[PDB]
Amino acid sequence: RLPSADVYRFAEPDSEENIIFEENPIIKAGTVIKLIERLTYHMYADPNFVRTFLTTYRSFCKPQELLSLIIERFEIPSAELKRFRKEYIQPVQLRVLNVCRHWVEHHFYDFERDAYLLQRMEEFIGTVRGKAMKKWVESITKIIQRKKIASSPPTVEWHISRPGHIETFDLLTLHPIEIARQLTLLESDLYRAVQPSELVGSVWTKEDKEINSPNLLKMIRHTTNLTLWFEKCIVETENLEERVAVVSRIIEILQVFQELNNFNGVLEVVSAMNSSPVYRLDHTFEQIPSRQKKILEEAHELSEDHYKKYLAKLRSINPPCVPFFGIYLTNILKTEEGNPEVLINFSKRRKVAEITGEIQQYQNQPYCLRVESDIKRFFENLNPMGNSMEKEFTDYLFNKSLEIEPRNPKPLPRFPKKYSYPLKSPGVRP
Ligand SMILES: Cc1c(C#N)cccc1[C@@H](C)Nc1nnc(C)c2cnc(N3CCOCC3)cc12
């Protein structure tokens, strides 16, 4: 029934040297030729294989090479001749177009990063002149052209800085309710923009990390800037009574971060408070009320163990949420290092793809908050390091900490004020 190997490379049957399954199918390993064959199997459909493959195929196959394989598998060279066209030719051709649907619909970034890859896809779909494959070709063409063309929020809160005067925006001049709202809207968009393929194969820690993981790095370096900006506002406020107001305001921003389920912002404040320059400021935290001490304690307990307390709280809240990327990136690297690579190992890619879907399920629901473009651009313009590098700026923050609160033998100096506006916080309630 089946052709030969010279005419069709997908003719060699399954054996121990190609395709390896698990216990009861679910594929564990195999060659790329066999991975495409089972991805387009004629006896049944497998949507779980398609979604996991197209998400993790770039870890073992290249996009230009994948298109050449699905086209090679598509172009297959009368008691059985009419049956072979219905039991093998027609169903396999439908499975190839099904992958093409899922490829352009959910992984279109591969095409807008390689124009030659998209041109070949449009030429292949144009050559498909079947009869039953018409509705699939129509759907593929519609998705391609669509991709190429591609209640009431509450009142915005203001404190000292009047609206429109972006030149006076600061941590104490802006309302802490609005600081967390805009940072939540800012971080939510940075989270929703991350594609799962940017986490497969540790591509964000390799050579081409900018073009393969453009959205993940932008999410990471934003967390670094806002954390360092929190630490910079604290240590550079030499006045003790003024630094207490700075830290207390960041605790109030954590309160709103918790009301909006922005766990990235909560742990950004946590990471800034646990940093070496901020954690040793014993004189500052003594004047912080016990109510704000408990809030920082509970937020830190989310980081104990492997964020297991954060995971438990995440599984008990609802849509409007901004997850934390760190705990998932850690579990991916240990899995991508624990499991090997070849036995090629596909259960490793599946195990990594299972982790991506856990943090991806919150990438749909938006926040019922109105965007403030001036406040948004202010936080987008944040660059606390400046010209200095990462290690040189963190060493400055700690030396600034050893200066504003010298260690045990030295006394505690008194420093002049730096903020001329009132320091009383407006409030945490809308
Ligand atoms: C509550 C608070 C305050 C005050 N007041 C002031 C600052 C921070 C915090 C939180 C956010 N950090 C922590 N909280 N509770 C424990 C039991 C912690 C135990 N260990 C740490 N680590 C910090 C990093 O180096 C290793 C030790 C942090 C803890």
Residue numbers in the entry: 568 to 591, 599 to 651, 671 to 743, 756 to 948, 956 to 1042
What text appears in the publication on this structure?
SOS1 is one of the major guanine nucleotide exchange factors that regulates the ability of KRAS to cycle through its “on” and “off” states. One of the major regulators of this process is the Son of Sevenless (SOS) protein, a guanine nucleotide exchange factor (GEF) that acts as a key activator for KRAS function. The binding between KRAS and SOS proteins helps facilitate the turnover of GDP-loaded KRAS into its GTP-loaded state. Additionally, functional genomic screens have identified that several cancer cell lines addicted to KRAS signaling are particularly sensitive to genetic perturbation of SOS1.15 Functionally, KRAS mutations lead to a reduction in GTPase activity, resulting in a higher population of GTP-bound KRAS and increased RAS-pathway signaling. GTP-bound KRAS also binds to an allosteric site on SOS1, leading to an increase in SOS1 GEF activity, thereby ensuring a high population of active KRAS. Herein, we report the design of a new class of phthalazine-based SOS1 binders that effectively disrupt the SOS1:KRAS protein–protein interaction.
Pushing out from the 3-position of the phenyl ring with a bromo substituent was well tolerated for SOS1 binding, and further introduction of the 3-cyano substituent resulted in the highly potent inhibitor of the SOS1:KRAS PPI, MRTX0902 (32), with a reduced lipophilicity (cLogP = 3.4). Based on the pKa of MRTX0902 (measured pKa = 6.7, ∼17% ionized at pH 7.4), the phthalazine is not highly protonated under physiological conditions; however, the local acidic environment of the protein likely helps drive protonation of the phthalazine core. The structure further revealed that the newly installed 3-cyano substituent on the phenyl ring presumably enhances the edge-to-face interaction with Phe890 due to the electron-withdrawing nature of the 3-cyano substituent. The substituted phenyl ring also provides shape complementary with the back pocket of SOS1, although the cyano substituent creates no discernible interactions with the protein as captured in the static structure. The SAR of the benzyl amine modifications show that the 3-cyano substituent in 32 provided the most effective combination of potency and lipophilicity and led to a nearly 6-fold decrease in CYP3A4 inhibition (IC50 = 3.6 μM) when compared to that of the 3-trifluoromethyl-substituted phenyl 24. Furthermore, the co-crystal structure of MRTX0902 (32) suggested that the C6-position on the phthalazine could be used to further tune the electronics of the core structure. Further in vitro profiling showed that MRTX0902 (32) was highly selective for SOS1 when compared to SOS2 and showed no inhibition of EGFR. X-ray co-crystal structures of these inhibitors reveal a unique salt bridge between the phthalazine core and Glu902 of SOS1 that has not been reported with previous SOS1 binders.
